[PDB]
Every structure is written in structure tokens, then in C-alpha cells.
Symmetry: none
Subunit: 62 residues, 6 copies
């Protein structure tokens, strides 16, 4: 297969992931896995052959 | 197969994921998996061959 | 396979991952896995052959 | 007197004076006097106190 | 008197005077006088006290 | 009097005077007088006290 990506960008501004929290008690922030950010972002064949990407989070409060 | 992507963008602004929380008690933020953000974003064949992407979150409050 | 990426960017500004927390008690920030940020970001074949990327976080409060 | 000029210009293109001539015999081009060209052009008190600006052209064909 | 000029220009292109002639016999080009060209062009009190600016051109063909 | 000029220019391109001639017989180009070219061009009190600026051109063809 052939994958061609072509961009001609002028004055491009990108914000990938933003998180804001205020006046809380507990804070659990998890940003992971396969996060691709850019002006020209390409993500091909992220998982191949019985792969795994968890990006999980546990929370037990006793 | 052939996949051609062509963009001619001028003054392009992108916000991928935003989260705002105020005056809470517990905060559990999970951003993961396959997040692609850009001015020209391409995601081809994210999962192939019995793959897995969880991006899960557990919450037990006892 | 052939993957061609071509960009002609002028005055491009990218913010990958941002986290803001204020007036909290506990702070758990986890940024990992496969985070790709740029003006031209490419991520090909992140996981191959029964691989694993956890990017997990545990939280037990007793 | 008070003269205030304020401009906030973005991507401004100005062409002051253009002259095109083709397949002629005689060519007499005269550009003078008080020609002001710009993105923010101000011309105050061009002539004061019995002044003179001719910007003339003569043509005698015998 | 007070004359205030303020400009905030971004990507400004200015062409003051242009002259094009093709396939002619005689060519007389005269550009003079008070020609002001710029991105912020100011011309104050060009002529004062019985001054003179000719910017003339003669043409006699016998 | 007070004359204040303030400019904040980014990527500014200026062409003052251009002349193009092709396939002619006689060529008389005269650029003079008070020609001011720039990104911030100011011309104050060009002529004062019975001054003179000719910027003339004669052409006799016998």
C-alpha cells in the first residue's frame, strides 16, 4: 500500500491535550498510549500482531 | 490500496481534547488510546491482527 | 509499503500535553507511553509482535 | 491642531502607481509631484505659503 | 501642532512606482519630485515658503 | 511642532521605483528629486525658503 500525506499550512496552531482542575481533593491525571500531535500528524499501524496499549488507571478509596 | 491526503490550509487552529473541572472532590482524568490531533490528521490501520487498545478507568469507592 | 509525508509550514505553534492543577491535596501526573509531538509528527508501527505499552497508574488510599 | 493616525494591519499589499504600454511609437511617462504610497500613508500640509508643484509635461510634434 | 502616526504591520508589501514599456521607438521616463514609499510613509510640509517642485518633462520632435 | 512616527513591522518588503523597457530605440530614464524609500519613510520640510527641485528632462530630436 501507498500512503501519501501533503500539507501546505501557514500560521497553524495546535493544542493536543489540555486538562484543568481547580479546588479538588484528589488528582489523578493519565495521558499516555499513542498520542500524536502536530501540524501534520500521521499514525499508521499503531498496533500490529496481537499488541496491546493499556493507558489504564485504577482508583480504590477505602 | 492507495490513500492520498492533500491539504492547503491557511490560519488553521485545532484544539484536540480539553477538560475543565472545578469545585469537585475526586478527579480522575484519562486521555489515551490512539489520539491524533493536527491540522492534517491521518490514522490508518490503528489496530491490526487481534490487537487491543483499552483506554479504561476503574473507580471503587468503599 | 510506502509512506510519504510532506509539509510546508510557516509560523506553526504546537502544544502537545498540558496539565494544570490548583488547590488540591494529592497530585498524581503520568505522561508516558508513545507521545509524539512536533510540527510534522509521524508514528508508524508503534507496537509490533505481541508488544505492550502500559502507561498505567495505581491509586490506593486507606 | 492634533492629527492622530493609528493602523493595525495584517497582510497588506499596496500598489501605488502602475503604467503599462505596448506596441506604441512614442513614450512619455511622468510620475512626480507629491506621491505618497505605503500601508499607512499620511500627507499633511503638502503646499504652504504660495508654493507650487507643477508635475507637468509638454509634447510638441512638428 | 502634533502629528502622531502609529502602525503595527505584519507581512506588508509595497510597490511605489512601476513602469513597463514594450515595442516602442522613443522612451522618456521621469520619476522625481517628492516620492515617498514605505510601509509607514509620512510626508509633512513638502513645500514651504514660496518653494517649487517641477518634476517636468519636455519633448520636441522636429 | 511635534512629529512622532512609530512602526512595528514584521516581514516587510518595499520596492520604491521600477522601470522596464524593451525593444525601443531611445532610452531616457531620470529618477531624482527627493525620493524616499524604506520600511518607515519620513520626509519633512523637503523644500523651505524659496527652494527648488527640478527633476526635469529635455528631449529634442531634429
Amino acid at each position: 500500500g501507498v500512503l501519501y500525506v501533503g500539507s501546505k499550512t501557514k500560521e497553524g496552531v495546535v493544542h493536543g491535550v489540555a486538562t484543568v482542575a481547580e479546588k479538588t481533593k484528589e488528582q489523578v491525571t493519565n495521558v499516555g498510549g499513542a498520542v500524536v500531535t502536530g501540524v501534520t500528524a500521521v499514525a499508521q499501524k499503531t498496533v500490529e500482531g496481537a499488541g496491546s496499549i493499556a493507558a489504564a488507571t485504577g482508583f480504590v478509596k477505602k
